[PDB]
């Protein structure tokens, strides 16, 4: 019974090994995927800000044209 109790301990340790390795690899992959997704999101935000700048420039040009034509 001592042998089998420590054998159950050994089995739990091996299961914990597999779980720990899988969790560490999953954490690393999740961090990498989060970094890539954040890169994509910030690139999209930068593009949207540039588009907003272009929109403001267009507003200025339209206002100038409207005033000059009047």
């Amino acid at each position: 019974i001592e042998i089998e109790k420590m054998e159950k301990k050994i089995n739990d340790s091996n299961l914990l090994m597999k779980t720990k390795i899988s969790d560490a690899e999953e954490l690393v992959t999740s961090t990498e995927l989060k970094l890539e997704e954040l890169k994509v999101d910030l690139n999209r935000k930068r593009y949207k800000l540039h588009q907003q700048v272009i929109h403001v420039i267009d507003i200025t040009s339209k206002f100038k044209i409207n005033i000059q034509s009047s």
């Binding site: 560490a24 954490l27 690393v28 990498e32 954040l38 910030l42 700048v53 403001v56 005033i67």
Partner: protein, 46 residues
């Protein structure tokens, strides 16, 4: 992993966020400068 890859990825995320914040601040500075130019363009109508 923790002190290395995970910490390095977190630091890279923070650096990317800082660079994005700097770019956003520059874009907003351009926005405010253009708005001030337009406000002055009101005065230049006279």
């Amino acid at each position: 992993l923790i002190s290395g890859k995970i910490n390095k990825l977190n630091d890279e995320i923070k650096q990317l966020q800082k660079d994005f914040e700097v770019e956003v601040k520059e874009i907003e500075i351009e926005y405010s400068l253009l708005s001030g130019h337009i406000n002055k363009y009101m005065n230049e109508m006279l």
